[PDB]
Design a protein around this ligand. Structure first.
Ligand SMILES: Cc1cc2nc3c(=O)[nH]c(=O)nc-3n(C[C@H](O)[C@H](O)[C@H](O)COP(=O)(O)OP(=O)(O)OC[C@H]3O[C@@H](n4cnc5c(N)ncnc54)[C@H](O)[C@@H]3O)c2cc1C
Ligand SMILES: O=C1c2ccccc2-c2cc(N3CCC4(CC3)OCCO4)nc3cccc1c23
Length: 256
């Protein structure tokens, strides 16, 4: 529930995305995949919008939100931060940067968190739909550095689709640190534009062949259970749903 706090820093990222840092209340506990609702009196004192927490709960003093300017309230928040930041680089640090006051209500849970309790997982996301998976991947890293035993998760298949290639930069560092530190090959990273990421990962092109991919994973893990988690558009969800029934994978209806 409800608690006053501050956007203390922000990040202006490609495809009109704000990388908000928010002072984490001293009593605020979340799980990776959790989201919250946020109110910004400066934009509207009546409106609450939900955003996935892109930070891992192991990061101790701030929450992260990655928000795309897509309409009225996000457009305005973007403009307010662009202008607050351009004005403080023209004026300068006359005094410490003033932090945008906000209300947060949460955390709210999503079935994505069940990944920490699966053996074999498929994560599929498009554009800003990466954000819950961003939180989950960072958490998995803190969790090997501290207790690889307590992890029943044996393989993670990651598919991230984007129409613009500069959107992969939102999380290119995280993807490096995994590429670097995944000596035991827990992860299978796949980036599609719908090698090129300057990653050891070959950025692929076109709509992926989801039948071919689901078949492949089935053969890797059968007869054990694979879980699918999807954050993206419904047309895709619908194709993925049929495919989960075909190859016997777990599906959650989160797309309507
Ligand atoms: C659990 C959850 C997590 C989320 N996490 C994130 C996240 O991490 N990052 C993120 O960026 N977003 C996230 N979202 C989306 C976010 O919550 C915002 O409310 C929404 O993305 C933007 O609100 P807005 O006022 O800016 O846009 P709106 O003005 O509501 O417009 C939104 C969309 O509707 C279109 N539109 C506008 N008017 C009409 C109309 N009359 N008819 C049809 N279409 C119209 C716009 O072009 C745009 O595509 C999440 C949502 C949920 C439910
Ligand atoms: O978990 C969700 C979610 C769950 C149930 C219903 C909707 C969402 C969800 C929607 C969403 N949108 C809709 C697609 C978008 C970006 C913002 O780009 C085109 C217009 O707005 N963006 C999201 C980004 C991250 C996570 C989610 C979402």
């Amino acid at each position: 529930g409800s608690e006053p706090t501050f956007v203390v820093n922000a990040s202006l990222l490609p495809s009109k995305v704000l990388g908000l840092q928010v002072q984490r209340p001293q009593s605020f506990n979340y799980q990776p995949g959790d989201y919250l609702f946020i109110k910004c009196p400066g934009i509207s004192k009546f409106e609450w919008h939900p955003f996935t927490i892109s930070s891992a709960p192991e990061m101790p003093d701030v929450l992260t939100l990655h928000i795309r300017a897509v309409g009225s309230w996000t457009g305005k928040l973007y403009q307010l931060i662009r202008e607050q930041r351009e004005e403080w680089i023209r004026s300068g640090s006359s005094q410490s940067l003033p932090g945008v006051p906000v209300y947060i209500d949460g955390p709210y849970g999503t079935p994505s968190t069940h990944i920490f309790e699966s053996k074999y997982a498929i994560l599929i996301c498009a554009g800003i739909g990466v954000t819950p998976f961003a939180s989950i991947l960072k958490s998995i890293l803190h969790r090997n550095q501290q207790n690889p035993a307590k992890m029943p998760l044996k393989k993670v298949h990651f598919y991230w689709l984007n129409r613009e290639q500069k959107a992969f930069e939102w999380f290119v560092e995280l993807l490096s640190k995994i590429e670097a530190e995944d000596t035991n090959n827990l992860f299978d990273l796949n980036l599609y534009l719908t090698l090129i990421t300057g990653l050891k990962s070959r950025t692929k092109t076109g709509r992926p062949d989801w039948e071919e991919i689901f078949k492949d994973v089935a053969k890797q893990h059968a007869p054990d259970n694979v879980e699918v988690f999807f954050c993206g558009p419904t047309g895709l969800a619908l194709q993925l749903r049929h495919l989960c029934t075909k190859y016997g994978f777990g599906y959650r209806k989160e797309n309507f």
